[PDB]
Design a binder for this molecule. Sequence first.
Ligand SMILES: O=C(O)CNC(=O)C(=O)O
Ligand SMILES: [Mg+2]
Ligand code: NI
Ligand SMILES: [Zn+2]
Length: 331
Amino acid sequence: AQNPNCNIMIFHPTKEEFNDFDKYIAYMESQGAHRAGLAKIIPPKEWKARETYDNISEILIATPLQQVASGRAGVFTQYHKKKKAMTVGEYRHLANSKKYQTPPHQNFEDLERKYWKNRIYNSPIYGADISGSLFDENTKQWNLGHLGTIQDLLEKECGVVIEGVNTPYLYFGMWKTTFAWHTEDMDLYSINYLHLGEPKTWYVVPPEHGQRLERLARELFPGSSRGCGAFLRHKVALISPTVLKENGIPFNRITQEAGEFMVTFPYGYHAGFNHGFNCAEAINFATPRWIDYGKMASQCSCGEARVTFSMDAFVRILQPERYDLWKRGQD
Ligand SMILES: O=C(O)CNC(=O)C(=O)O
Ligand SMILES: [Mg+2]
Ligand code: NI
Ligand SMILES: [Zn+2]
């Protein structure tokens, strides 16, 4: 078995290997990459996502989210308070302000220590889930707006034709902006490209050990667990590396820099934070190996997680028993 310790693998495809997306994903899995739940892909040196970022300040963040924490430094939840709209230019200037900017630090490790010590005491503002793309239409390789769609994958593998579309989303971050512990909707893959700015630190639990993280989360967030049998789908809970180590949960960490892709694999729980002002683009995708994970994916039916139009069909086809109850939650 390849990669039996479930380490995060880093890939360096040549320009030739960067032509066929599906094939390269299947290659990385042949080497065991998926066992970690997360992989990094460094593009060939010839490749670029677009020519410059010189003209992005006019993108609108219609509903910036202030991420307010509650709890203790290593075990907390966050709620998102909606703020008034602002442009990317306005947000970048806010991120760089004295109140929100990255503090002085020695290296990524010192900054990681400062994040876990001090996150809860601040409320950074995140522009998340903004439909759109920053890839130039002429970028033909690994263009996250030109991938094969999940609906077409399900049709190719299973024969069934379904409604729905699959488009990318932009994320504008600042120091301390935080992504809570989660897997993807329907335990899909994700791919995330860091277009510009400061790094993103990731934490991930191997898919084969995901239920260990779930059991710890039920112990650490006991009222949330009583409320919903899949409350990590709410994307609100944080648990630090120190707390994971104290509780024996297997995990790995890695820092993504501008110009790099990350892939998350089905049922790979992940969380993380941004180091400073940045912009990322991400989208879900599927392969043949995902289908079985999609059939088994948990679902939030308490009504909090409230998700896309396209998830309907996935539930209806892959989880017809749950259909009914999940759509009671979704209405
Ligand atoms: O970059 C972010 O804030 C969060 N992204 C993801 O969880 C992802 O790509 O799967
Ligand atoms: Mg613009
Ligand atoms: Ni994710
Ligand atoms: Zn729920």
